[PDB]
Design a protein around this nucleic acid. Structure first.
Lengths: 754, 103, 126
RNA sequence: UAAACUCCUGCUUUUGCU
RNA sequence: AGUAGAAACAAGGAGUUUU
């Protein structure tokens, strides 16, 4: 007979079996080539939905940017970023009138988070865009390259450990024209050999000077790198994700600090937390809308979504918000939050890599950079891409594209959500002064709305009042991907809701397996993922001892460590049996080297070796009790018990895991493609230094537990300790005070080297 | 003046107050008075300290040599002029090897 | 610990920020790192506030326990830090919300069912 | 010039030099 | 050819020798 499984929704309700319609089992779509065609199809789409603002021209930039807000009102259902400043302020002047005193309260923690934060808060995160090398360097090396730009510039003024003078000089860096950056290029030498009398070559790296301008640094200071959103699910196309620059996120950390602090004091943004508080907030307001549930009301919910949510923002009304939610605040504080919506409203996206061309005659390929797109024989392109260049060939400045309207992904959330919930604030009945009233929630772009009114004519008059309210601020709800129905059935970032009881089925299971960080610490996080998702993401009992049963089956395939009772063969089987026949504790031996699987769903929270400890005979764990451990390299507190495992709710999330230090917690291999780049000199200089920076960090005890923040000059820094190491050993100690004089003698001998 | 700080003094007190001023954000010396309050104060710190050693018998005297090559030791310990780490490091290093309360 | 039989009752879970393993003395998270900073090596504390009187005895007990461990790494220090961190994580708690019941939280609660669960140890007095 | 052999790399191969 | 899907891979990268 003909078999289809999608007919079992004829019996099971759709929100109870909705996980069958999540193809999260196959691979996600990847972008293959670039994002150059994807960035230009967003700089076009931003300047199409905002096409009627006045085209200014920036003074220090040369950018022909668009100034789209408080322009002509939209007069169709096509989305439009023409936001009304006298309604952005107005719809969140009603944010304080519902929840009183939010803004000056929430600034006051933000005025204290600004007064205790180092620069180290911005060196953690995603890979960023440095401006020195014009490339996605990761978040440490981009920060620790731009700082010695200032040191190789005249004015450092930043080395005081706090980031606000680091956020003073990034404004001041836009004053010094000659920005003498560092360039290193690769050369060769010629040495001899005395043993074999042969004369061979040797590789080394040179040094080169380079300078900038004020129409060349300011672009690179305001440059967003545009990647492609790899491994997004649920979209046939792709999209550009934006990587903010190095200077930008310093100001942006304070802006989302404030803006997250708003949403934790509000109660309709599920975003500042994880998914479990979101299920509370979701099912909160379905009951909050049964507060005024009269004898005859009609309450239709809206399973909303916002289409083109990122292009139809504008950081010019972000500046309108954070000028208003910092009312009567100090002058320095209102200023420092204000730089980030300024340098998003002059931001200049790069155009990615470029395009790969193909000869159908000479059988040759090549690829141009994205910068050559200002000057190309336009018949090199097919008919679709040729349309995309001509609509933004006026916008190419210095290989970038001036994109002042619109945000885009990977840059900033949680303040446009504050905007998006403030319209949902306005449906509170004290503000409507009519029979219809609404409330709901607002995620990043997927919202859910519940409106009520005493007949269908009221709801119809209540839905569009909301829709024409969101049009005043550039929030354009997806008329494709949204619908209305009565209460009890909606979704909200795929948290489906059936009459009261949510089925999660969002970030379903991309992992459930060996997410190899180590060999033990991906079992300790392995059995934690089955543990945590019995709580958070709601998998039941039998699938928890299936996702454990199979977790081990590919824990033993990646790490080859099958049992001895399986007589199958791999790189070792024989000396495992030495552990089998000698240890009287057969069934307590550890499983990262061929043991039984004592785990079940009574004991996931127990770690691996602390589970298998009250059974082992003294030899094995005593062979594991060796604290020398050439296989550990005892980490730092930010990296002790931290793996970066991505959900589908956010860009990244670190989650911890009870991992005992053991010989199986080793660090995996560094990638070696940097050895063949012409960027070798960023490694051979710096590979020698964490050999010896941690030789200093032996001499402080708390340096491997706390950040050491003192004077500069690491060589001068330990000798200040060495002479206070000296006297408390001199006044009292076990060692002789003549060997003290040897400790004395080294100190000036350091200074005898100038 | 800050030129008077640069001229009629020695640069060892100036530069150690250059690092000591680069702590709160007044880095181009726009104060020019707390830049002048501390450089006067730090010159007291060296004139209260130097040309005094600690002998083997324990007597208080002066020695006109002044050439340690890190072989002789002083009697007053320089704490002001160090950083906020290195101050509290030396402060706590006294209170742990003695019976002194912590300030 | 001892298990009870299955009480087949439905799940009406409550999703509240509930504590995970706070441990001893209910000390502040920075103040938790303060007593650890003493016992790792005392000369790096920088604590403008010394301690309260209740911390003055409990750090003296922890002081000799590190020599009682072994010639010990620094990692024995920041696991004593881990039993003092009061973690408060919002979790759907269908049942009791205590730092002895919070580590299981999945063994006990569910779909058609609850699992009655009595872990061993000292049932408290306060 | 066209053929073969020689070393590195498999996320850093997105691009700045001589 | 094939994979693939709005742009890609189908080795990249360094050396030597012969119209």
């Amino acid at each position: 007979m003909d078999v289809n499984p999608t007919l079992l929704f004829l019996k099971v309700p759709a929100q109870n079996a909705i996980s069958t319609t999540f193809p999260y089992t196959g691979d996600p779509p990847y972008s293959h080539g670039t994002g150059t065609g994807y960035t230009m199809d967003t700089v076009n789409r931003t300047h199409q939905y905002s096409e009627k603002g006045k085209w200014t021209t920036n003074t220090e930039t040369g950018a022909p940017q668009l100034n789209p807000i408080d322009g002509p009102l939209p007069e169709d259902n096509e989305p439009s970023g023409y936001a009304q400043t006298d309604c952005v302020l107005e719809a969140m002047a009603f944010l304080e009138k519902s929840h009183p005193g939010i803004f000056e309260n929430s600034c006051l923690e933000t005025m204290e988070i600004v007064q205790q934060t180092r620069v180290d808060k911005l060196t953690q995160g995603r890979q960023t865009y440095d401006w020195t090398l014009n490339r996605n360097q990761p978040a440490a090396t981009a920060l620790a390259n731009t700082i010695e730009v200032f040191r190789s510039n005249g004015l450092t003024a930043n080395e005081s450990g706090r980031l606000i003078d680091f956020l003073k000089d990034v404004m001041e860096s836009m004053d010094k024209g000659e920005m003498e950056i560092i360039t290193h290029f690769q050369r060769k030498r010629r040495v001899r050999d005395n043993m074999t009398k042969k004369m061979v070559t040797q590789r080394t790296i040179g040094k080169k000077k380079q300078r900038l301008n004020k129409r060349s640094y300011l672009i690179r200071a305001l440059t967003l790198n545009t990647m492609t959103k790899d491994a997004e699910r649920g979209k046939l196309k792709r999209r550009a994700i934006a990587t903010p620059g190095m200077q930008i996120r310093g100001f942006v950390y304070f802006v989302e600090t404030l803006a997250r602090s708003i949403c934790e004091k509000l109660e309709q943004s599920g975003l500042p937390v994880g998914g479990n508080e979101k299920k509370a907030k979701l099912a909160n307001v379905v009951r909050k809308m049964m507060t005024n549930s009269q004898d005859t009301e009609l309450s239709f919910t809206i399973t909303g979504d916002n289409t083109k949510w990122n292009e139809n923002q504008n950081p010019r009304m972000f500046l309108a918000m954070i000028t208003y939610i910092t009312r009567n605040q100090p002058e320095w504080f209102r200023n420092v939050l204000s730089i980030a919506p300024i340098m998003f409203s002059n931001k200049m996206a790069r155009l990615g890599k470029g395009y790969m061309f193909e000869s159908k005659s000479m059988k040759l390929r090549t690829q141009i950079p994205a910068e050559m797109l200002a000057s190309i024989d336009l018949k090199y392109f097919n008919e679709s891409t040729r349309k995309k260049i001509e609509k933004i060939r006026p916008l190419l400045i210095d290989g970038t594209a001036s994109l002042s309207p619109g945000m885009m992904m990977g840059m900033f959330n949680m303040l446009s959500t504050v905007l998006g919930v403030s319209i949902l604030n306005l449906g509170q009945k004290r503000y409507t002064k009519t029979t219809y009233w609404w409330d709901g929630l607002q995620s990043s772009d997927d919202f859910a709305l519940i409106v009520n009114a005493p007949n269908h004519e009221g709801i119809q008059a209540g839905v569009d009042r909301f829709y024409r309210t969101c049009k005043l601020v550039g929030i354009n709800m997806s008329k494709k991907k949204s619908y209305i129905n009565r209460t009890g059935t909606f979704e909200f970032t795929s948290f489906f809701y059936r009459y009261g009881f949510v089925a999660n089925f969002s970030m379903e299971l991309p992992s459930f397996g060996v997410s190899g960080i180590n060999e033990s610490a991906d079992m300790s996080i392995g059995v934690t993922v089955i543990k945590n998702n019995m709580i958070n993401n709601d998998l039941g009992p039998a699938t928890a001892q299936m996702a454990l049963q199979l977790f081990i089956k590919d824990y033993r395939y990646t790490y080859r460590c099958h049992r001895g009772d399986t007589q199958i063969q791999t790189r070792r089987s024989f000396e495992l049996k030495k552990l089998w026949e000698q240890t009287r504790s057969k069934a307590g031996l550890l499983v990262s080297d061929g043991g039984p699987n004592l785990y079940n769903i009574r004991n996931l929270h127990i770690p691996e070796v602390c589970l298998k400890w009250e059974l082992m005979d003294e030899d094995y764990q005593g062979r594991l009790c060796n604290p020398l451990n050439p296989f550990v390299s005892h980490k730092e507190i930010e990296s002790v018990n931290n793996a970066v495992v991505m959900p589908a709710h956010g860009p990244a999330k670190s989650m911890e895991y009870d991992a005992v230090a053991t010989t199986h917690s080793w660090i995996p291999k560094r990638n070696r493609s940097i050895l063949n780049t012409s960027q070798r000199g960023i490694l051979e200089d710096e590979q020698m230094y964490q050999k010896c920076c941690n030789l200093f960090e032996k001499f402080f005890p708390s340096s491997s537990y706390r950040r050491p923040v003192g004077i500069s000059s690491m060589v001068e820094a330990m000798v200040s300790r060495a002479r206070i190491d000296a006297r408390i050993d001199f006044e009292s100690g076990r060692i002789k005070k003549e060997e003290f004089a040897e400790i004395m003698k080294i100190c000036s001998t350091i200074e005898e080297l100038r | 003046m800050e030129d008077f700080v640069r001229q009629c003094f020695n640069p060892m007190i100036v530069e150690l107050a250059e690092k000591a001023m680069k702590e709160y954000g007044e880095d181009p010396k726009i104060e020019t008075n707390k830049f002048a309050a501390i450089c006067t104060h730090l010159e007291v710190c060296f004139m209260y300290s130097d040309f005094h050693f600690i002998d083997e018998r324990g007597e208080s005297t002066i020695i006109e040599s002044g050439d340690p090559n890190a072989l002789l030791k002083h009697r007053f310990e320089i704490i002001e002029g160090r950083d906020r780490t290195m101050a509290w490091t030396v402060v706590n290093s006294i209170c742990n090897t003695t019976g002194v309360e912590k300030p | 610990g001892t298990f009870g039989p299955v009480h087949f009752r439905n799940q009406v879970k409550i999703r509240r920020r509930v504590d995970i393993n706070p441990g001893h003395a209910d000390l502040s998270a920075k103040e938790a790192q303060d007593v650890i900073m003493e016992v790792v090596f005392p000369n790096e504390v920088g604590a403008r506030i010394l301690t309260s009187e209740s911390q003055l005895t409990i750090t003296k007990e922890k002081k000799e326990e590190l020599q009682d461990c072994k010639i010990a790494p620094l990692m024995v220090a920041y696991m004593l830090e881990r039993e003092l961190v009061r973690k408060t994580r919002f979790l759907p708690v269908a049942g009791g919300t205590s730092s002895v019941y919070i580590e299981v939280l999945h063994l006990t609660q569910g779909t058609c069912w609850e699992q009655m669960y009595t872990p061993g140890g000292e049932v408290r007095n306060d």
